[PDB]
Symmetry: C5
Subunit: 307 residues, 5 copies
């Protein structure tokens, strides 16, 4: 089979959609193979830029369309180039911008550690007609962490494997295995904006909700706890307008639920404290001394559910 060497350059990885489970990758792909020799004008290799390639495909020149398995729709190919050396080898250099899918589990949202995967495969030619020799992925486009939503860690893990298709065994006798390239670029989400802007205000608001037990009146405690509940419902907005709309719950959503439950349990506790009286003569001194026990128990529960 024709041996094709792929070299993929990643200019950037942006546009991470979480409900769509996609991400936008821009870059270049170079596919170099060999064939029959040809007579170029002079000894120099011949350059066939975009458009003019299709004239050569009409003439009978073999250029395989290496598709992306995990891309969503047709990628926006920009300029494509075909370099034809006189000795017989062809280089196909195409610039792409595509929207690619992955698994992308987004639990532990501010501290996400995921990988962006590019799966390249010939659209038509199996391992008996086209075979990928090696891939080098030059993702040199990695930089500082200070201005980076995602920090790319390490290099890109490249794998060349063979995928066996079950449906093609009906139409093909025994040649139905396609050469596939999997490229995995591991990234870690930047948590500092979420840690400073969403976690610490939640801690401050939940502690201020704990502080309702330091009032010396029952009706003041209920009205204060309702003001605190109104404060919580509002934080939910702030986050839900900014955090991604993934289809499950995260650490921040769970802390929101925990603050809801804290305020509701405080309301139940102060109502039970006021109406524990058998004849309305006993005060609220003993169980109202949960000023430093209820926050401790709630923090223990939170430590349980986080880990």
């Amino acid at each position: 089979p024709v041996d094709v060497s792929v070299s993929i350059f990643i200019n950037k990885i942006y546009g991470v959609n979480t409900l769509e489970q996609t991400y936008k990758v821009d870059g270049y792909i170079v596919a170099q193979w060999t064939g029959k020799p040809r007579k170029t004008p002079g000894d120099k290799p011949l350059i066939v830029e975009n458009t003019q390639i299709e004239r050569w495909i009409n003439n009978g020149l073999w250029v395989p369309a290496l598709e992306f398995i995990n891309v969503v729709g047709s990628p926006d190919t920009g300029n494509k180039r075909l370099m034809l050396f006189p000795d017989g080898r062809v280089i196909y250099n195409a610039r792409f911008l595509g929207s690619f899918s992955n698994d992308m589990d987004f639990r532990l949202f501010p501290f996400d550690r995921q990988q962006f995967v590019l799966e390249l495969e010939p659209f038509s030619y199996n391992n008996q007609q086209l075979r990928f020799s090696d891939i080098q992925v030059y993702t040199e486009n990695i930089d500082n962490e200070e201005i980076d939503e995602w920090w790319i860690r390490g290099k890109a893990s490249t794998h060349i494997s063979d995928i066996r298709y079950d449906h093609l065994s009906s139409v093909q006798p025994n040649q139905n295995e396609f050469s596939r390239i999997t490229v995995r670029i591991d990234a870690v989400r930047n948590p500092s904006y979420y840690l400073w802007s969403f976690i610490l205000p939640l801690g401050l608001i939940i502690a201020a909700s704990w502080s309702v037990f330091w009032l010396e009146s029952f009706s003041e405690r209920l009205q204060t706890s309702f003001t605190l509940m109104l404060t919580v419902v509002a934080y939910a907005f702030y986050t839900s307008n900014i955090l991604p709309r993934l289809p499950y719950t995260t650490v921040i959503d769970q802390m929101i639920i925990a603050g809801y439950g804290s305020i509701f349990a405080a309301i139940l506790l102060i109502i039970f404290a006021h109406h524990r009286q058998a004849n309305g003569v006993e005060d609220d001194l003993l169980i109202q001394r949960c000023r430093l026990a209820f926050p401790l128990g709630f923090l223990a529960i939170g430590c349980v559910l986080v880990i």
Copy 2:
């Protein structure tokens, strides 16, 4: 008529729009039919990739354009392939990304059980010229439930039928019935994010609204009930900024209305309790003992309207 076998592979189903009643489907479609034999170069089948197909259509090769009935606009076809065997049969393999419509009733929104429907039909050839033999839908792209907005349940129900067009009987004598393929993939919406983030806070807020009757002052009760009403109007935002903008009401919207009515009825009850006095000497003890009757009656009403 020419017998065409279709095989549709669904890579993903995403982009569910509820006010538009559409959803985005990516995948492949393979249409295999038979015809007159041809002489390929060698005994090998011939591959005609994208673009080069239209040269063969210019030459006179028959490739039918199988359109999608329920698609919205023109689908974004990526790479298309034409495999021509020497024995005479043709395979047309096209990758599509389209936006498809359905009925999509979205009442009972967090517990939706809908189906995504692909309707394939020849654009031009009726059952006297083209007939679909069988379709197998390989929606193997189904996975866990833990990170899945929609859980695909079961396989894809495939139907091949004939649709009779009334307008074509004027232009065609008696050949006006088109072979249509209907593919239905049944999915169930993931409710856990909506159950934990939108239903349980509504229950906690409505219970805190019930707790206004445990105050011992009338003016405190009114000011507290107005703080509770302000808390409710805010929850409406949180949801309406996040939940889809379908054109009717759902379980969460109905619970919002129920909380509104609960607070308004509590305001009416406490005003009626304070101004039940004939001369301003009688207290509020009897009808203010709806602390455990008004929540019970409201829960009974909610149980009626849910089922």
Copy 3:
């Protein structure tokens, strides 16, 4: 002139933009005319699918480009078909998805009764070269009301008329009148989501604002009225984040303004009641008995401004 019969099928009408005054229409258009006879292969009519039509236009075949007058930009034509019978008549079947404009008065917003208008006209040929014979609009795509933002009422009103262009009389002597088709599909907006989610909460909030007069303290009444004013400003969000951004006022906006004025007038009334005292010894009993007169007068004013 060449007589063309049009048949327009409306698959759906969606994407109603109110500040843009547009709406998205998907469907098919069939234009059937007659001409000189031709020799098809066999006695069968010939099918020229997309792309291949332009080869026939290069050859000299007459296909007129029937444009949409009220479309915004170029419509997304999908598959187009040309059926050429041997007897001499041509059928042009094109699938379109376009964004069309209209007048679209959106006053009385939740109870809107508008019409969606398609205006078809030849781009080049006046009534002396092309004339529309008849149009039948098969908008059979109408269904239940339970899951329908807009309920299509009745059939589609079709009109074939002649439009006289003033600018073309300079370049054409007396042949400057173009055959135009106007198709009007009357629809009524579904009001139940707006009635239950936006009108009834406004009524409950405005009634709760009326209830400020049942307090027995002046400072309590002012602080309560300011809490009510804060509750109103918030409802404005809920709606303005969800309701369309048309450039005027609607019933819901007018009710918002009415609630604003109600709270402001209540503030003025209670301040005037407290400071009506000549020497600070007289109470607030007489004009504070507007508990059941101020809501009645406000309801009378609202009944005046609604009708």
Copy 4:
């Protein structure tokens, strides 16, 4: 030089972006010039619709590409037509939808009076090869004010001028001046939605903020002023979610700042009134009589800053 007469029809002007300083214009453009005579089939003028024009451009027919100077990107040309009379004159009729830029000062936002400008120029031919004779702009697409975001006032001011390019004097000896058409359509923004929905609630809220001085307690006055400050911060949302995101301040933003300053100054005034006591025996009677002086002074300041 070849004399070209332009006639521009404006179907609509929509899509006004304020941070982008663009607006979307749909319409038609007709360019009529004269040339060498040709033999049409018969005495009738010949119609070359879209696509088929490029065959004639390949043949050697002169059609100049009149570009838009202020357009952003390539305009979405729909159908284009070429009318070739036998006497020798050519008409090029193209339908465009483009996004055009202007200066667009958006200070005094609800009462904006701007102009939408179309600048047409040959892409290649200077005044020695192409010259615009006259332009008539038929913007008959103007209508009522009741449902119109922008009211077009008057006609469209048309100017034909010559623009001298400094860079072209290096590559061209003395022929570097291009014929440019400037079309200015003056429009006035509809203010009634902003006046009723954003200005009047601001006036009511600021007056309610003035009313804090009618309380008879200091702590009540501070807590009330903080409730009023919380009410103001919320109005900021309502507007900033709805008003355009231009990069400066407007009348509504300035009124928001004025209400902020009013509440802050009221807080300072009541704190200074309570702590003006030398030994805590003197009441707050004199400077607390700014109930009708502080609003008057603030209204005078607002009248100064508005004009």
Copy 5:
């Protein structure tokens, strides 16, 4: 090598995306080189407008595709022109609208001083085949500051350099260095909208939060501080709905965190003041005199963290 002179005109720079770190640039690019002489019709230079250029590329005319290194996807090229003089030199004039990337550190967000960078490079020809002679960037499209999100300061810094590619040394012996043009246009963000609408209200709200110490009651101080905390959580929305969603923290976000900490520290201080009593007989006079020390210390801390 062939010497190419580039001249880039920037019509506008808009569409600054901060989480994407891109910006949209519209303009023209002129590439003028020399070659073999040709016989034009007459002594006049020949104009080949869009489309017709590709016929000349098919004929064998050398037009290099100068790509943008930092562009995201394929730029929206509008009209392109090819001017061929008889003496032998070629001018390629193309209008582009592209989305370009840069580093774009957005710390100190309202007072950003960044640069917009265009990197032009031949897609195929190294410095042994194509060399850029000089670039002049005519960014005359700079204007007032009063209506300008970004103020362009100075001219555009232009650099012509050579970039050595490491991967090309395997396929090319010693000719692997590409001529690159870097154009940097320095801009400063307009801060006045953010300064008046987001910084000054934050200062007023934080000062009003300082004013909680002037109350004379402990329970009043806690309930007031919780109202102030609810006021802060709301300001977070206003900003986060309007400010860009960059992945770190800015001056406004840090001021939000500082106000959060101020209110939390005030709550801790007043609780510690009330419960400093050994037997409940001592008042809160000494440490409650942090009315003018706690704001001063917080302002000192803010002055430390700003610089």
